[PDB]
């Protein structure tokens, strides 16, 4: 267990949020502000609790030591201030002080920027920490690597905390992964079965079903000897698959829709698994086989979403992700989904408000299905004992 932020006395006290505001930003301005109104509840949660709140966050990937105005937290200081409705200082020297008030909240520049910051230095951990008399970790979407801003401040502030949204997000995660309700179906799409394959193995003991999409479903389709054409899979991996089709049951695609090519005269056509061409490239499932998988998963209890089934920003490939979209957006399951694939898959198809829970962890979302210790969730644990 974690402490929790809400549970906590904030009153006058500083309190060092880290949240995820790492958003597109074009010419200083931001573009898409999901993440931002997602951690706007923990930013007005603090202050309610009469807290001097200081935000801290990531953008891009800078070079650490120099600053680099396109990497600047500035555009989204702007957006805060009007969020807000009051002035959201971006402070850019703070490591040796800064002057919060009770009351007030600053956002801290880019951590990035800090020396220390990607290797977890120790030095740059206790002058994070010195700030502030409680550090809340909001920030799910980068829990799963080990820096200054998400795991080193936590071993050295006088208290360690989750955010609600972190909070929110553990317990989704934990529904579905921890004895979800059976029968449980996942749906794994990527390029590579080796690219995913432990998230294939931990989804393969807890899930009763697993549909697979793009090149993991034409491993699997070849490892069950069906012809693939001129689709990537991965001959060093047909034996796992097998061993995971034997573990769980991995429905193949009855029908396939294939094209010889991109192009203005490029016909998508449906075939049957067995009648796909060498010159074919599988680009999405069938009608029919979106129509059986669909009600595969109407009667699902849980539902684990990682993955659309075809090349669906083209709409003649699209078919089977949509298919699949309203299936999991109608079915009465705890459905939760992650990936910046599937997002946008949500976002295309309109079922955002369908699906229980929707994770922007992306890389730490597959950690965490994966099984594999989250350092920014260990760090607060050891925090939380007596």
Same mark, same amino acid.
């Given at each position: 267990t974690?402490?929790?932020?809400?549970?906590?006395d904030?009153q006058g006290?500083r309190v060092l949020?880290?949240?995820?505001?790492?958003?597109?930003?074009?010419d200083?301005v931001v573009?898409?502000?999901?993440?931002?109104?997602?951690?706007l509840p923990?930013?007005?949660?603090?202050?309610?609790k009469g807290?001097?709140?200081?935000?801290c966050?990531?953008?891009?990937?800078?070079?650490?030591?120099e600053?680099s105005?396109?990497?600047?937290?500035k555009?989204?200081?702007?957006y805060?201030?009007?969020?807000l409705?009051?002035?959201?200082?971006?402070?850019?020297?703070?490591?040796?002080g800064?002057?919060?008030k009770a009351?007030?909240i600053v956002?801290?520049?880019?951590?990035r920027?800090?020396?220390?910051?990607?290797?977890?230095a120790?030095?740059?951990a206790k002058?994070?920490?010195?700030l502030?008399?409680?550090f809340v970790?909001?920030?799910?979407?980068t829990?799963?690597? !080990? #820096?200054?801003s998400?795991?080193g401040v936590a071993?050295? $502030?006088? *208290? +360690? &905390?989750?955010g609600?949204l /972190?909070?929110?997000?553990?317990?989704?995660?934990?529904?579905?992964?921890?004895?979800?309700?059976?029968?449980?179906?996942?749906?794994?799409?990527?390029?590579?079965?080796?690219?995913?394959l432990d998230?294939?193995?931990?989804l393969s003991q807890?899930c009763?079903?697993l549909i697979?999409?793009?090149g993991?479903?034409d491993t699997?389709?070849?490892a069950?000897?069906?012809?693939?054409?001129?689709?990537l899979?991965?001959p060093?991996?047909?034996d796992t698959?097998?061993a995971?089709?034997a573990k769980?049951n991995?429905?193949?695609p009855?029908d396939?829709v294939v094209?010889?090519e991109? !192009? #203005?005269?490029?016909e998508?056509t449906?075939?049957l698994? $067995?009648d *796909? +061409? &060498?010159?074919?490239?599988? /680009?999405?499932?069938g009608?029919?086989?979106?129509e059986?998988?669909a009600?595969?998963?109407?009667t699902?209890?849980?539902?684990?979403?990682?993955?659309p089934?075809?090349?669906?920003?083209?709409?003649?490939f699209?078919?089977g992700?949509?298919?699949?979209?309203?299936?999991?957006?109608d079915?009465?399951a705890?459905?939760?989904?992650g990936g910046?694939?599937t997002?946008?898959a949500?976002?295309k198809?309109?079922?955002?408000?369908?699906?229980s829970?929707?994770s922007?962890?992306?890389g730490?979302?597959?950690?965490?299905?994966?099984?594999?210790?989250?350092p920014?969730?260990?760090?607060? #644990?050891?925090?939380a004992?007596?």
């Amino acid at each position: 267990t974690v402490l929790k932020m809400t549970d906590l006395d904030l009153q006058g006290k500083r309190v060092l949020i880290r949240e995820d505001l790492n958003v597109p930003v074009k010419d200083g301005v931001v573009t898409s502000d999901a993440r931002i109104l997602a951690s706007l509840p923990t930013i007005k949660l603090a202050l309610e609790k009469g807290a001097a709140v200081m935000v801290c966050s990531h953008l891009g990937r800078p070079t650490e030591g120099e600053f680099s105005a396109e990497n600047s937290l500035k555009p989204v200081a702007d957006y805060l201030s009007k969020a807000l409705g009051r002035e959201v200082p971006l402070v850019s020297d703070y490591l040796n002080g800064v002057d919060v008030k009770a009351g007030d909240i600053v956002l801290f520049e880019n951590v990035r920027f800090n020396k220390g910051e990607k290797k977890n230095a120790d030095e740059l951990a206790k002058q994070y920490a010195a700030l502030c008399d409680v550090f809340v970790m909001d920030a799910f979407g980068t829990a799963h690597r !080990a #820096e200054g801003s998400t795991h080193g401040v936590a071993k050295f $502030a006088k *208290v +360690a &905390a989750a955010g609600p949204l /972190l909070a929110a997000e553990l317990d989704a995660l934990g529904k579905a992964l921890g004895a979800p309700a059976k029968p449980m179906a996942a749906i794994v799409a990527g390029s590579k079965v080796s690219t995913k394959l432990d998230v294939l193995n931990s989804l393969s003991q807890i899930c009763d079903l697993l549909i697979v999409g793009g090149g993991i479903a034409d491993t699997f389709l070849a490892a069950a000897g069906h012809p693939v054409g001129k689709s990537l899979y991965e001959p060093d991996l047909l034996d796992t698959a097998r061993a995971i089709a034997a573990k769980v049951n991995v429905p193949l695609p009855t029908d396939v829709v294939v094209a010889k090519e991109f !192009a #203005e005269s490029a016909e998508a056509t449906v075939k049957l698994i $067995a009648d *796909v +061409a &060498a010159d074919d490239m599988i /680009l999405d499932i069938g009608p029919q086989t979106a129509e059986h998988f669909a009600q595969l998963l109407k009667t699902s209890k849980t539902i684990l979403w990682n993955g659309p089934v075809g090349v669906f920003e083209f709409d003649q490939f699209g078919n089977g992700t949509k298919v699949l979209a309203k299936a999991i957006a109608d079915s009465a399951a705890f459905s939760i989904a992650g990936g910046g694939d599937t997002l946008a898959a949500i976002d295309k198809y309109g079922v955002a408000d369908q699906i229980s829970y929707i994770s922007t962890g992306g890389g730490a979302f597959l950690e965490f299905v994966e099984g594999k210790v989250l350092p920014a969730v260990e760090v607060l #644990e050891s925090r939380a004992k007596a």
